[PDB]
Homo-oligomer: A and B are copies of this chain.
Amino acid sequence: EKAVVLDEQAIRRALTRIAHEMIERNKGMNNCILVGIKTRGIYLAKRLAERIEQIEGNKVTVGELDITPLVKGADIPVDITDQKVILVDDVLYTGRTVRAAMDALVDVGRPSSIQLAVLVDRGHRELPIRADYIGKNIPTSKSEKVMVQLSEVDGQDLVAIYEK
């Protein structure tokens, strides 16, 4: 059983607000790198970069990590040394994918700091990891599953909760 809890318009509004918060907290996002995780993180990062560029007239670099968890691959097209990185995640749940991402980036890139932006936080963390920017908090039971669909890969924009 499935329920739609954010529709396209809710997703658009959340991303616009997150982009504003990124401009407020990171001096207009000059020199700060967005790194997507999971399949849909990179597409969220690109959407954010576009919103920021439409305001600041600058270029916001987007990279990605390929994580199962094990970091199996990466594409980060600038040197992140001493730079601000923001991880972009579709759904924050246990935090274990974020931890894998974080350890790889500190180890290989020596950024000055790493923040976390998520479209949805579904709670039930298993590590002391919290998002800095959040589209929507969505309370859940343990047995529920939260999924994000985006235009670029699934063909439409929505967030759904699935029951057991």
Contacts and interface: CB of A to CB of B under 8 A. Distances in A.
Interface residues of A, number: 20
B126 A113 contact: yes
Contact of A112 (B99, B112, B125, B126): B126
B102 A127 contact: yes
In terms of DSSP, what is the predominant structure of the interface of chain A? mixed
Interface stretch (A19-27, A41-49, A128-136, A148-156): A128-136
Contacts of A116: 128
A128 B130 contact: yes
A69 to B, nearest CB: 10
9 contacts: A87-B128, A98-B128, A99-B106, A106-B127, A113-B126, A113-B127, A114-B128, A115-B128, A128-B131
Interface of A: 87, 96, 98-99, 102-103, 106, 112-116, 125-132
